[PDB]
Homo-oligomer: 343 residues x 4
């Protein structure tokens, strides 16, 4: 009657075992605090800077991740007048059917499934990268893994294939960080407009505590949430596309702001089209477009992606990203448009 397609159960460290091995340093604590503050301001129209969330499609090699972090950390500080730069530290990836689930689920890319090692690796990384003063971002996919990492997160996303999940809007309503919801795979923007409304509200659901115990949590509600236009059946980063979502959100009585995602369905998957989308969004930002509050970009040390018989350094094992040299031109190419939007 029970547990008959359940093969094994294996012990899983409680969040406090990670929270006490890898406590957040004074520096760390202050990166996330400030970074969360900064993005709040950008969302309440009290800042005109651009939230840019840029980085690999998915972490899988902490060494490569650190070269990228300290490279981008320089541009966080050179463009800190037009850009609020945040690194794309994605430990979990939702695969269309099957495939590698991210670092935390399978950190030795071998179906070992050393998920305890996973979070150890993940948390130490998230930790280190926050020390340097760079802020981190991630997709929130699992219902349990947030408790181990979220205190180091400064901006999260709910996957497209999860923007309708009640359980996922429930989670968004309690996270301490801002959150972005992606429009639906077909480009439906209301299922996301709906999640913003839910997320902004209090909920009361079942979940796991830092001690690894089932419990009932009540959430205050999170009003720092926005849409992420990722296009769908056809790219939708246009200035008039933006104007639809803009109107739409006014109809729903939510603030008219948007994060454009340059990749996936706005790039026809062609990794290099992030430059095209990039060149189109910058025109909108120069033209005076006040409502483009942020940007998401897929970006690694080296352009392209590889299958999973050895590992090319610095290159994605999942979605395909623009290389670093392109990144530089892209980020400076934003700061300039944000310059052209006020001076």
């Amino acid at each position: 009657n029970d547990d008959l397609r359940i093969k094994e159960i294996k012990e899983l460290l409680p969040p406090v075992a990670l929270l006490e091995k890898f406590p957040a340093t004074e520096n760390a604590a202050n990166t996330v605090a400030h970074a969360r503050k900064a993005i709040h301001k950008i969302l309440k129209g009290n800042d005109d800077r651009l939230l840019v969330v840029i980085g690999p499609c998915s972490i899988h090699d902490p060494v490569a991740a650190k070269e990228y972090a300290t490279r981008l950390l320089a541009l966080r500080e050179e463009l800190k007048d037009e850009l609020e730069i945040v690194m794309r530290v994605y430990f979990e990836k939702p695969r269309t059917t099957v495939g590698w689930k991210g670092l935390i689920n399978d950190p030795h890319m071998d179906n070992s499934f050393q998920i305890n090692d996973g979070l150890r690796i993940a948390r130490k990384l998230l930790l280190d990268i926050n020390d340097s003063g760079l802020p981190a971002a991630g997709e929130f996919l699992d219902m349990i893994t947030p408790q181990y990492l979220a205190d180091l997160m400064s901006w999260g996303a709910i996957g497209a294939r999860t923007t309708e999940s009640q359980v996922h809007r429930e989670l968004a309503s309690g996270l301490s960080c801002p959150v972005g919801f992606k429009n639906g795979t077909d480009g439906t923007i209301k299922v996301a407009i709906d999640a913003i409304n839910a997320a902004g509200a209090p909920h009361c659901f079942l979940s796991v505590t830092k001690w690894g115990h089932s419990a009932i949590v009540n959430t205050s509600g999170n009003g720092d949430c926005h849409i992420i236009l990722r296009g769908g059946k056809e790219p939708n980063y246009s200035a008039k596309h933006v104007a639809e979502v803009k109107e739409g959100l006014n109809k729903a009585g939510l603030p008219a702001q948007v994060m454009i995602d340059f990749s996936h369905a706005n790039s026809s998957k062609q990794f290099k089209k992030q430059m095209d989308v990039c060149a189109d969004v910058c025109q909108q930002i120069a033209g005076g477009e006040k409502a483009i509050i942020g940007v998401m970009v897929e970006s690694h040390l080296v352009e392209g992606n590889q299958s999973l018989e050895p590992l090319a350094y610095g290159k994605s094992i999942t979605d395909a990203c623009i290389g670093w040299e392109d990144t530089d031109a892209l980020l400076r190419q934003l700061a300039n448009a944000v310059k052209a939007r006020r001076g």
Copy 2:
């Protein structure tokens, strides 16, 4: 940095304690054991019969629910040769934003006595099985299945969650067979990926019968199927069934489906479940063996009402359903259409 928006945590009863208060009776386990095997044999093409998942949209009064079961159990016998009738015991009922469900606000006032809700919902589930009528629920979250899924013989995944990885991960390790609702928007590529996906072994994090996190390694679920339920327009046609039949095979999957006479297929009006029913029996009697099931929002009294004064007995507090006499006709219609085939 920690827990700035979460501001209160309350104690929750572990699965192990609800299975101890309310243990499966030899009868209840018997009904679940046979009912699943019944549906498995159907789903491997080994049985003309039609699985009918029918019952209220949501349960809110255990009393009206035991009455429904005794009635529906009666018909589950009568037509046992043609229909495999499985009652539908749904608690939580997704909505963008009153009622969270029976488990979640069992007292219908935002007291959120999940613990009462859970004791109640399992006890009702228990009794319906001990009487011998299988139940079929809907798995939304990841903690709640650990308290109930032993008394369920079939399950569905909400329309707004068929795309989610976490819910396909959950179907990975269900002992009951699973149905996936196609997309809100009538698409079915998502339903296909979920079947494939839930049919793959998985390893994820989940709560145990004792209320601790752990790692699970599931086996993959082989008894899954799409669930047609409309989109822009309804899609209960046979034009439609022909596409899904095709693509399903193009997907290298068993060209079988289950049609939901409700939701986007009823174009909302609850009585239109009868219209859809009429159309299906044409096919089943026509000779369409790849319609292996149907799903009806059926209560004791037709229509619905709104939470406020007391409530009409036997009339849903959520979606409007056909009442009991529409329920008798519809079941008899289906079972007639069944043994046309011959």
Copy 3:
């Protein structure tokens, strides 16, 4: 590690409280007896508590045939006594032996503790529901949470009266608690127990969820000394003198419960009624301080060797030897005559 051979799962205390909840009546029993005993220890009543029953429960069938017989006398002597059946599920050995029904219910070294706790609590509930309070010994530190709400009086073993953690446990026990003198007949130890248990403590124990935590107790004031013999018996009136004024030197209620079994019987089950005579003589003589007594009683008298391994007889204790029923009615009758004779 090196010496932990196996680790099986244990049903949490919440699970038994949920499968065997106090009926409204049983709640009443547990609660009236608990206030009664408090009123004895304050002098505002003058009946004699009487914890009397088997040495160890091992047949839930005989323990109910017993409880109905003992309950039948409980109601009759209502006004003299305050009978509390002896439902000890834990027993300690000088060295190695069978530890009680909870720790080995099928006395076949199966150690089916989960069955043990189910059987123990179900029996415990049957008895409080038919009006008969239960008394027990608190040996283990985790079992209490599975049973404490169905016990109206509790003892701390002669061999654990010094143990800091058994004092801590009584400091937060909700029923009232009796401490035995040292196995060598020392009072200092038991006085200290009362005093330690009289004050609040902060320590680790396990909540009703099977979870370790820090608990702050309040302190238990309904604590008294149990006299149980030593090298030679302390049921005297000479000793009752010393114990009374030693207790007044500590500055504590000058009262004492007297055991009749164990060292005061000199491991001689029948000599239990020789002690009765002496105490009813003190009690019928105007000794007000004898506020309780305890007596090892079963259906048939004597005992049998589980360590045999023939088949077992019905209603005979498998550990310490007890009187049989006929003596117990007679013993309970003289106690009631003594208490009335006392006024």
Copy 4:
């Protein structure tokens, strides 16, 4: 009907959170691994050396204890041919009724009862000592603290006040290290014999795992236990008492070995008397007492004690200071020389 007297409940970290934050180094694991084996070899009679457990009554300051530890590690390495020296690292102290409970309980010494710091201080201190080659020894009073601390322990005692308990002889029967049971608060050796025998059996009982969940546990049983002579209202360290414990151990069919506390009741409550006992046991050991296999000295940087604040002076029972401690460990290494010939 319940919790009428439970004033409150705060969360306690699981043993695993601490095993993760202060994992044992390769070195610490080795100090432990080796020290245990040493004490096994002594116990089973295959090494004529003498286990010396020595150190403060209670760690209250960790800095003083780290200084003490270096001083004693020098001595341990210098006498390793006659002596196995492990430090007395006693966190949980058992008071006669109500008083300061020790560093794991109320670390800051003011009734905060910050048990989560305590545990944290107590494990880093133990790890630091073990990492630096010096084995450690402590009291096992609680039923839960062992799970955060056990793995950095080479030897433990069961308190004088808790030798008879089923719940403590159960614990002993699963500890990965040797154990010594003290006699009872009057000189009784019967309790200690029974304890060693019980602690030698396997047991099944309820405990908390490394994760903080109650669960069922079967022990294998612990052969590495022995009696700890500590005295009554009259000290029982003189050869006469030693020969009584000897035959008694034979009657109960146990190896006839012993460890002699120099303190508590063989000190008759004055610390400097610990030196006297030493001379006597040193006589016995050099006479050719193979029965005596270890001792226990309460020793600190500053002799004497204070109440509640001096550095390295004990703040519970009085101990000898470092000049007397150097003297004493040497007297012992010499009787261990005499004894071998």
